[PDB]
Ligand binder design. Structure first.
Ligand SMILES: O=c1[nH]c2ccc(Cl)cc2c(N[C@@H]2CN3CCC2CC3)c1-c1nc2ccccc2[nH]1
Length: 269
């Protein structure tokens, strides 16, 4: 009775969506802490044990947090950090976006976690608003790593070649290169999220020259949408992130030294 009941987590509101389905909400029975519980099947692995193995690495307040998992046979109960704020996705007004300051804030915290993960040599590989969560105090938390993978290990980097993520966010070299560096791809996806945060619409369908939109951008025709909606400062920033050559793109270390990234905008409380 060192307990009693405490590890009884009641199933409730269905948070839904990926990976594939479903992540539930879990009030605890005794203390009713709230937790994110992702529900997975035997029908994966071993892709699961990978997600769970990575998820046991993450320790940052901008990265969703791991607690454990119950085996329950061919159903895995994933115990993950809960955020009440919901998807950053749902904070972007369509065709509008949001207040530059709110956007810059959210972006720092995104850079925060993405620097961190890259820190420990991991890449998320599907950064998008549906995947960037917000707690009660609107703090961005990167979630879902069933897709994230190890790219550095023992100091040595690995070039990725697997195509994955989400077309509108995925960077160009994912579509034109056999192998690529993991980090430049996460920056682009982050840049794209900045566009959507400052524009409330996505720039293009895929980073294919085959896309009228993508070509105009590489034309510099930034009187078109969305860049038209975007102010000059951050638009100077997206001009460095959304750089087709992954070797010429901006690096997060330099993104930290960008005029707009370091322009004062938002107040707290
Ligand atoms: O708090 C969460 N923690 C997670 C930890 C890991 C994973 Cl894979 C998902 C979530 C996760 N859901 C993904 C975020 N999105 C929906 C389900 C799931 C995939 C895409 C939430 C969440 N909290 C919410 C609060 C309100 C509304 C939804 C919410 N989802």
């Amino acid at each position: 009775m060192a307990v009693p009941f405490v590890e009884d987590w009641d199933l409730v509101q269905t948070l839904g969506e990926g990976a594939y389905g479903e992540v539930q909400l879990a009030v605890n029975r005794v203390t009713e802490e709230a937790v994110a519980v992702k529900i997975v099947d035997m029908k994966c692995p071993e892709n699961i044990k990978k997600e769970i193995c990575i998820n046991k690495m993450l320790n940052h307040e901008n990265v969703v947090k791991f607690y454990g998992h119950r085996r329950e046979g061919n159903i895995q109960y994933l115990f993950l950090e809960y955020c009440s704020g919901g998807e950053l996705f749902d904070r972007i007004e369509p065709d509008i976006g949001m207040p530059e300051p709110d956007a810059q804030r959210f972006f720092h915290q995104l850079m925060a976690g993405v620097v961190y993960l890259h820190g420990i040599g991991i890449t998320h590989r599907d950064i998008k608003p549906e995947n960037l969560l917000l707690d009660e105090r609107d703090n961005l938390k990167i979630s879902d790593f069933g897709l994230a993978t190890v790219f550095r290990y023992n100091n040595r980097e690995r070039l990725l070649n697997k195509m994955c993520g989400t077309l509108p966010y995925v960077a160009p070299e994912l579509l034109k290169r056999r192998e690529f560096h993991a980090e430049p791809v996460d920056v682009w996806s982050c840049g794209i999220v900045l566009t959507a945060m400052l524009a409330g619409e996505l720039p293009w369908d895929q980073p294919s020259d085959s896309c009228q939109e993508y070509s105009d951008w590489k034309e510099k025709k930034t009187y078109l949408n969305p860049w038209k909606k975007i102010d000059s400062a951050p638009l100077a920033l997206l001009h460095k992130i959304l750089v087709e050559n992954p070797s010429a793109r901006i690096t997060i270390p330099d993104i930290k030294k960008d005029r707009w990234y370091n322009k004062p905008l938002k107040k707290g409380a």
